[PDB]
Amino acid sequence: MDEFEMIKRNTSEIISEEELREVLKKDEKSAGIGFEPSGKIHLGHYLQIKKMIDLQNAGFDIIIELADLHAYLNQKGELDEIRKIGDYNKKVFEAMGLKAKYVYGSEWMLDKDYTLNVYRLALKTTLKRARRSMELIAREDENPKVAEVIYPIMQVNSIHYKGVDVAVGGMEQRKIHMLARELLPKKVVCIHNPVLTGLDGEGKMSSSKGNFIAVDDSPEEIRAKIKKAYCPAGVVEGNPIMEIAKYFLEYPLTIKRPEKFGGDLTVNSYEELESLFKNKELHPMDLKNAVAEELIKILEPIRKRLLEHH
């Protein structure tokens, strides 16, 4: 793999590939991603941080926004409490192996120049357009607030105000990214990561839906969560156990199982694992056993770094 293929690996879409090839030529190039401070950091965050590490290995200067005002507008609580949670997320991100520039959005979202462009962008953004970009982001509210439509123009304005070359995020951010590419004079290259399925197979993995694996979960907690996880035999779509093996596990992958069930099975790639699973040649119980133990080894250095603080 070259540097472009390393960045494209395990992404849902790149907007666009030709524009990304331009950015890779530059000596200096920045990539940014924002997270609303979350009480628990799960594999969804780890997947995005792993992609930010790929960009860092490719010569990108990484910037991480601890989006305190975004979480405040999205009804996550008060600013002072949101900020201390964001400081906890920074420690977890650094424990993941990401050395970057962690900044709070409120450090620039109150500048007069930034605020003035918020009003300019509001003139160019329709209410229907702004609401459509927040369908997969806005916190559930039977009575949507004006803050829901201010949210997307704040994220577009930050991209313009700070001038990153590449913006990274889940597929739920694509409509906001499509709006930034239409309204801003400099088009930002967008890298969109897949949205992990919840452990119960119903919806996406969310910190507020209790269907996630936290990066600092104990080994016994990981084994129990995977044991109860949705993993129908032969079904790869919507299977969170297969997603974990595709996006986090390293290959070759040695699957250990008793001799009475076929003996240990070595798989050199995820495409080989998917083939063994579609035609029921690998049982979900054996898949869950290997995925749980390998994921525990993956997250052990992260949980250890966090346990050392106590």
Ligand X SMILES: N[C@@H](Cc1ccc(NC(=O)[C@H]2CC/C=C/CCC2)cc1)C(=O)O
Task: Name the site residues for its own copies (rule: CB under 8 A).
Answer: 69, 72-73, 75, 110, 112, 115-116, 119, 121-128, 130-131, 143-150, 153
CB of 297 to ligand X, least distance (A): 28
Contact 228, 235 (CB under 8 A): no
Is there binding between residue 36 and ligand X (CB under 6 A)? yes
Distance CA 10, CA 5 (A): 10
Contact 96, 54 (CB under 8 A): no
**What dihedral do alpha carbons 4, 244, 44, 305 form, nearest 10°?**
-100
Is there binding between residue 162 and ligand X (CB under 6 A)? yes
Distance CA 140, CA 156 (A): 22
CB of 274 to ligand X, least distance (A): 29
Nearer of residues 111 and 300 to ligand X, judged by Cβ: 111
Contact track, ligand X, 231-270, x by CB under 6 A? ----------------------------------------
Helix (H) or strand (E) holding 30: strand 30-35
Is there binding between residue 192 and ligand X (CB under 6 A)? no
Q: Residue written as tokens 């986090």? A: 248
Distance CA 78, CA 82 (A): 6
Distance CA 57, CA 174 (A): 24
Nearer of residues 111 and 271 to ligand X, judged by Cβ: 111
Q: Which of 14, 20, 29, 34 binds ligand X (CB under 6 A)?
A: 34
Distances (CA, A) of 170 to 10, 81, 102, 163, 302: 12, 25, 19, 20, 22
Is there binding between residue 216 and ligand X (CB under 6 A)? no
CB of 79 to ligand X, least distance (A): 15
Q: Which of 7, 23, 33, 43 binds ligand X (CB under 6 A)?
A: 33
Q: Residue written as tokens 């080994």? A: 219
Contact track, ligand X, 61-100, x by CB under 6 A? --xxx-x--x------------------------------
Nearer of residues 25 and 112 to its own copies, judged by Cβ: 112
Could you tell me how many residues of this chain bind ligand X (CB under 6 A)? 18
User: How is residue 234 written in tokens?
Assistant: 């032969």
Nearer of residues 134 and 302 to its own copies, judged by Cβ: 134
User: How is residue 11 written in tokens?
Assistant: 């992404």
Stretch binding ligand X (CB under 6 A), from 81-89, 156-164, 226-234, 266-274 = 156-164
Nearer of residues 144 and 163 to its own copies, judged by Cβ: 144
Distance CA 36, CA 89 (A): 9
211 binds, among ligand X, its own copies, none (CB under 5 to 8 A by kind): none
CB of 103 to its own copies, least distance (A): 17
Strand order in the sheet with 166-170: 13-15, 189-193, 166-170, 30-35, 61-66, 101-104
Contact 240, 205 (CB under 8 A): yes
123 binds, among its own copies, ligand X, none (CB under 5 to 8 A by kind): its own copies
Alpha carbon 185 to chain centroid, angstroms? 27
Q: How is 50-68 classified by DSSP, letter by letter? A: HHHHHHHHTTPEEEEEE-H
Residues lying near ligand X in the complex (CB under 6 A): 32-34, 36, 63-65, 67, 70, 137, 155, 158-159, 162, 164, 167, 169, 173
